[PDB]
Amino acid sequence: QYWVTPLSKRQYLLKFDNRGVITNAVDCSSSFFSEIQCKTKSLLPNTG
Amino acid sequence: LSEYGTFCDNINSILDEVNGLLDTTQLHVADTLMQGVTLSSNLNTNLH
Amino acid sequence: CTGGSEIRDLLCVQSFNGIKVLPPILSESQISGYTTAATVAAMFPPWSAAAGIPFSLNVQYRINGLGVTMDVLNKNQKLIATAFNNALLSIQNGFS
Amino acid sequence: SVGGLYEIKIPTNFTIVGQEEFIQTNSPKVTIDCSLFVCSNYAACHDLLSEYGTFCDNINSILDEVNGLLDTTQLHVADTLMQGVTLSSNLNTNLHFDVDNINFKSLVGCLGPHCGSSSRSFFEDLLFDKVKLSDVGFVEAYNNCTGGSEIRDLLCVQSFNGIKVLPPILSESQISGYTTAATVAAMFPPWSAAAGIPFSLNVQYRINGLGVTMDVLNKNQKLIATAFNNALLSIQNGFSAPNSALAKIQSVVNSNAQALNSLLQQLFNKFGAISSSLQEILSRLDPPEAQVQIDRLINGRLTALNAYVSQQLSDISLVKFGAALAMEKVNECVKSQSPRINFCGNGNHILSLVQNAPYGLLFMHFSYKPISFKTVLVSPGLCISGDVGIAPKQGYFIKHNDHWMFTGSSYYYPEPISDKNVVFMNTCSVNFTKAPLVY
Amino acid sequence: AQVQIDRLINGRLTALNAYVSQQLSDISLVKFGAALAMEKVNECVKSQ
Amino acid sequence: AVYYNSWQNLLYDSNGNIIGFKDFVTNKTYNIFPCYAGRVSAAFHQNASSLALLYRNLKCSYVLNNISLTTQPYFDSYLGCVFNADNLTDYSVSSCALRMGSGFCVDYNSYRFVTFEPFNVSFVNDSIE
Amino acid sequence: FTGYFPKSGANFRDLSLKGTTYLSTLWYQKPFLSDFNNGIFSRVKNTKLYVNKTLYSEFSTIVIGSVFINNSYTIVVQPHNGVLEITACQYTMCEY
Numbered sequence A: 001q002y003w004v005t006p007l008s009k010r011q012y013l014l015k016f017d018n019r020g021v022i023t024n025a026v027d028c029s030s031s032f033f034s035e036i037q038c039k040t041k042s043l044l045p046n047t048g
Numbered sequence B: 001l002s003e004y005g006t007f008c009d010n011i012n013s014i015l016d017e018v019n020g021l022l023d024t025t026q027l028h029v030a031d032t033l034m035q036g037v038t039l040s041s042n043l044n045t046n047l048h
Numbered sequence C: 001c002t003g004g005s006e007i008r009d010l011l012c013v014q015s016f017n018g019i020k021v022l023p024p025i026l027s028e029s030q031i032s033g034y035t036t037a038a039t040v041a042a043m044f045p046p047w048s049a050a051a052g053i054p055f056s057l058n059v060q061y062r063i064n065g066l067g068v069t070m071d072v073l074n075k076n077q078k079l080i081a082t083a084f085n086n087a088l089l090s091i092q093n094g095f096s
Numbered sequence D: 001s002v003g004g005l006y007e008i009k010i011p012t013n014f015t016i017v018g019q020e021e022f023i024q025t026n027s028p029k030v031t032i033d034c035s036l037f038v039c040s041n042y043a044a045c046h047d048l049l050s051e052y053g054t055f056c057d058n059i060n061s062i063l064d065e066v067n068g069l070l071d072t073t074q075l076h077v078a079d080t081l082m083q084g085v086t087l088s089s090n091l092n093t094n095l096h097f098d099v100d101n102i103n104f105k106s107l108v109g110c111l112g113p114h115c116g117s118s119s120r121s122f123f124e125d126l127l128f129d130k131v132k133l134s135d136v137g138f139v140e141a142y143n144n145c146t147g148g149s150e151i152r153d154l155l156c157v158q159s160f161n162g163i164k165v166l167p168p169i170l171s172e173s174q175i176s177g178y179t180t181a182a183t184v185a186a187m188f189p190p191w192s193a194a195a196g197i198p199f200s201l202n203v204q205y206r207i208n209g210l211g212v213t214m215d216v217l218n219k220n221q222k223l224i225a226t227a228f229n230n231a232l233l234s235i236q237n238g239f240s241a242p243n244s245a246l247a248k249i250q251s252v253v254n255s256n257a258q259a260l261n262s263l264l265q266q267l268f269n270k271f272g273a274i275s276s277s278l279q280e281i282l283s284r285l286d287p288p289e290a291q292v293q294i295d296r297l298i299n300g301r302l303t304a305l306n307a308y309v310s311q312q313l314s315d316i317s318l319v320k321f322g323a324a325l326a327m328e329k330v331n332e333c334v335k336s337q338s339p340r341i342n343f344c345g346n347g348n349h350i351l352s353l354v355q356n357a358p359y360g361l362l363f364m365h366f367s368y369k370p371i372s373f374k375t376v377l378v379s380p381g382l383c384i385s386g387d388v389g390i391a392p393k394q395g396y397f398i399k400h401n402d403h404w405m406f407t408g409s410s411y412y413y414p415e416p417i418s419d420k421n422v423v424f425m426n427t428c429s430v431n432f433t434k435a436p437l438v439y
Numbered sequence E: 001a002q003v004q005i006d007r008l009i010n011g012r013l014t015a016l017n018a019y020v021s022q023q024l025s026d027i028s029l030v031k032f033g034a035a036l037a038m039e040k041v042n043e044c045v046k047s048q
Numbered sequence F: 001a002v003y004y005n006s007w008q009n010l011l012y013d014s015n016g017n018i019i020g021f022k023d024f025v026t027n028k029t030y031n032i033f034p035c036y037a038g039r040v041s042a043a044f045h046q047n048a049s050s051l052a053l054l055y056r057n058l059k060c061s062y063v064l065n066n067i068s069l070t071t072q073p074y075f076d077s078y079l080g081c082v083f084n085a086d087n088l089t090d091y092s093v094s095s096c097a098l099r100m101g102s103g104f105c106v107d108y109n110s111y112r113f114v115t116f117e118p119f120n121v122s123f124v125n126d127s128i129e
Numbered sequence G: 001f002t003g004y005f006p007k008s009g010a011n012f013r014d015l016s017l018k019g020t021t022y023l024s025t026l027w028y029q030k031p032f033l034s035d036f037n038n039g040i041f042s043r044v045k046n047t048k049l050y051v052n053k054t055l056y057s058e059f060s061t062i063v064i065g066s067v068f069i070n071n072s073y074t075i076v077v078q079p080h081n082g083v084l085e086i087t088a089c090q091y092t093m094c095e096y
């Protein structure tokens, strides 16, 4: 299996844990939920 | 505009807070109008 | 704003430039329901918005509290009621 | 109406309900060192900032005025709590803490200076322990900025950038001393904050004023006193769970922290310059181009301060009006019972008490609450003897044992009609129920 | 184009700051108007 | 520290500031903290020939060992290190032109650091029972 | 952070091709021969095989270039059972 997908210059939210590993990320312009996650700089935004 | 940083985030945050005050005020006015209001189930628009 | 009308509403120009008035959380129809409820609560039992007594008696006791004898005030009840409803009509006509 | 009578639900039993109301009377005294915020210690930036002249002096002057208004407001609130408070020097709150079966000990801290700062009540302790950034919280947080801790407290980053919250002129310990004094002034002679009579009698007369006969109140004094102390306990237990007053207190701290964080974040905005760091500009560009980049940072940071100061002026106007309302509630709900219906909270307001809270006052409003009701046929007036008119005072005329009697409007207890519960008229009104055989 | 657009951005951002300051001030007056209205509902309409 | 992999030598905060580094030559790791910065709050009375200085939230050992030594007398007040004022917090004043915060006042005759108590209870010796 | 990242919600294409003896000429044309543009993100299964219970790692080699002729450099990333040989040379790439 050799899965490939195109790269492009994109803004991502990157979450680093207490040991410096990137545990989660968000492609900000990929969806409306991704847009709220990036706006609030949070993986799980507050109810609103 | 993205290189100006948080300027638009602050404009949105201040208007959201101001609009939240208007919403909270409208609820307090409605609460004040309805406070202690007790009506008979027998009231009808066409006869009373 | 999505309509084909030649008359461009200035509000559509404003909203396409990001300036928009959002509706309030409670509609004016709901607030009118609350002012209606607060108004009928004054005229029918249990009179919960009129000190627990008939609206006409509350009017009479309020006028008496100004230093008007109850004697003239309870014989003139229809004159007081018509003066009250004429005052209300004068307010409505005032908006014309 | 059937004959001259109407159906009304009159309460047959009641309880006392307690309702909290936090009123914000103060806010964190934010101070900004304008040139330390705009330029930190870069001499090239301070040289350029000096050419803007009075801009930083205006920022400093407006915040000094706003903070002077907060200080003046806190003194006026403290004066209002202490006004007219006269206490016995024999009062020792370690012994003297319940009266007439009503328990005040959770509302009363130690009285007098010999106990030090411990004049905070158990109820105030239970409220201040849920808010980290009280006046003492800010002092302790800033005390740790030079403690050498590895923790990067955001308040230390803010204060090194010139953003620091100063303590209020009166400590929250002094304000809890004043709410303590204002509270014991209601429960012991001379009752200087309870209209000059025993607290249980003031509660009784206030419930009677709602149209409850005195007979049921003075026989149920134990039930009323326990209902009052259970209402107070329900208020205290209500802080152990999601609460609108506790949330309102925390929203004061959270909105201040958010505004200070947002202001600190403006130091990282580039404002179209090559970098937000003055060190990076001064380590990349010569004086003529560095000046062009530093001037963009100066304009952006001065604009940010002007926006913050304008918002701070607007927000403290709300704090001044909030404090004015709190003072009005101390005077018209706590020290006296003003004849204003929903001013002291909702419903049948009996009486109100006050306790200190972070940046404000916690009012406890006690209200008479009907538990159960009897539907009864009432007459709003009677026509008697020589067509003399009678209207019931704070009550209704009732047919009981097929005889005309009176009942209070807030408690169903038929008692005989008399000049004590009647308003007389030389002529009866139309529709008053004809009762020729009465009196 | 960046030099001309940055002048438009500073002008439009200054206009938004002025508007937001105006709106903050106006809503404070609306809150005090609502407080007076609630006081008149309680002290003139529901009771005298 | 243990978070530096073989290719990493700089620790950054979310704002892009350098806050730590692994020294390339010695492999030793250090946290970087901002140098102390702040303000002096000077209380001045028109009749005085000097100032009372409050270094808010700083202990006097820190002021003398890390800011500037001085000839003036000093003590650690609740508000921070106070210079050129006598510690008299057991004394109190009902009016205060130099309000320092948390119920503290600077009073001028030397300057005195004193408690601000603008309001008191009117006491009576009458019985409580 | 802004960087060279995949589009979230886009599709990955499995371009791996396993043959035994025959090679199809269609395997060497679009859509397999792909435009590089800014770059690509690859998720690659390590096909762990076994010989006499000894583990061996195998996966598809990727070539990146322009015309794939010895007048130009072709980047080749090839696995050798735990060794990843990466070269960029003027290779005479085969037709197939």
Ligand SMILES: CC(=O)N[C@H]1[C@H]([C@H](O)[C@H](O)COC(C)=O)O[C@@](O[C@H](CO)[C@@H](O)[C@@H]2O[C@@](O)(C(=O)O)C[C@H](O)[C@H]2NC(C)=O)(C(=O)O)C[C@@H]1O
Binding pocket: G016, G017, G018, G019, G020, G021, G022, G023, G024
């Ligand atoms: C990209 C793709 O489609 N990949 C599949 C492949 C091809 O379609 C096929 O190669 C094309 O062929 C052309 C171009 O003509 O088929 C595979 O499966 C075969 C059957 O389709 C497989 O069973 C083989 O069957 C034999 O009869 C024979 O020679 O094909 C005997 C041989 O020993 C045996 N190989 C073994 C033992 O692995 C394979 O592998 O080759 C599975 C692959 O996923």
Ligand SMILES: *[C@@H]1O[C@H](CO)[C@@H](O[C@@H]2O[C@H](CO)[C@@H](O)[C@H](O)[C@H]2NC(C)=O)[C@H](O)[C@H]1NC(C)=O
Binding pocket: D098, D099, D100, D101, D102, D200, D221
């Ligand atoms: C009436 O006076 C008596 C004292 O003669 C009070 O009784 C005390 O009440 C407290 C509770 O507040 C009890 O803990 C004490 O044990 C009681 N003492 C005695 C001697 O009974 C009483 O509180 C007063 N008030 C009322 C309304 O009864």
Ligand SMILES: *[C@@H]1O[C@H](CO)[C@@H](O[C@@H]2O[C@H](CO)[C@@H](O)[C@H](O)[C@H]2NC(C)=O)[C@H](O)[C@H]1NC(C)=O
Binding pocket: F006, F025, F026, F027
């Ligand atoms: C600092 O740490 C690096 C590893 O992160 C050390 O480099 C390794 O040193 C060993 C022993 O000489 C070699 O076998 C490795 O091949 C080196 N790896 C790399 C990536 O260079 C380095 O020696 C350490 N330096 C000090 C002074 O402790």
Ligand SMILES: *[C@@H]1O[C@H](CO)[C@@H](O[C@@H]2O[C@H](CO)[C@@H](O)[C@H](O)[C@H]2NC(C)=O)[C@H](O)[C@H]1NC(C)=O
Binding pocket: D146, D148, F065, F066
């Ligand atoms: C303030 O000045 C003192 C005195 O110079 C510094 O004291 C040093 O503290 C470190 C440990 O923190 C010791 O290893 C040194 O031996 C001490 N003495 C000297 C002369 O360095 C102190 O570190 C300074 N700064 C702070 C933040 O306390």
Ligand SMILES: *[C@@H]1O[C@H](CO)[C@@H](O[C@@H]2O[C@H](CO)[C@@H](O)[C@H](O)[C@H]2NC(C)=O)[C@H](O)[C@H]1NC(C)=O
Binding pocket: F075, F076, F077, F087, F088, F089, F090
């Ligand atoms: C400032 O003066 C006050 C009053 O004397 C000091 O507080 C007293 O200190 C002694 C000795 O530590 C204690 O026994 C007393 O109980 C304290 N009284 C109070 C009201 O706290 C205070 O310690 C002095 N401050 C300094 C830094 O010297």
Ligand SMILES: *[C@@H]1O[C@H](CO)[C@@H](O)[C@H](O)[C@H]1NC(C)=O
Binding pocket: D012, D013, D014, D371
């Ligand atoms: C009033 O209600 C309480 C709680 O339900 C009950 O304990 C008490 O017996 C009731 N008293 C009367 C007079 O109904």
Ligand SMILES: *[C@@H]1O[C@H](CO)[C@@H](O)[C@H](O)[C@H]1NC(C)=O
Binding pocket: D137, D140, D141, D144, D147, D149
């Ligand atoms: C200050 O530091 C001490 C010692 O680390 C700690 O016990 C205390 O909780 C800290 N307080 C605050 C508010 O940072």
Ligand SMILES: *[C@@H]1O[C@H](CO)[C@@H](O)[C@H](O)[C@H]1NC(C)=O
Binding pocket: F047, F108, F109
């Ligand atoms: C300061 O001096 C003036 C006279 O110049 C005097 O009236 C005032 O009382 C003095 N105040 C103090 C605190 O010494």
Ligand SMILES: *[C@@H]1O[C@H](CO)[C@@H](O)[C@H](O)[C@H]1NC(C)=O
Binding pocket: F094, F117, F118, F119, F120
């Ligand atoms: C408080 O006590 C002091 C004791 O000297 C006295 O001067 C003052 O007048 C009292 N009252 C007030 C309101 O300050």
Ligand SMILES: *[C@@H]1O[C@H](CO)[C@@H](O)[C@H](O)[C@H]1NC(C)=O
Binding pocket: F125, F126, F127
């Ligand atoms: C209260 O003070 C006055 C004046 O010193 C004194 O005459 C009286 O005896 C005192 N009463 C008590 C109970 O100490």
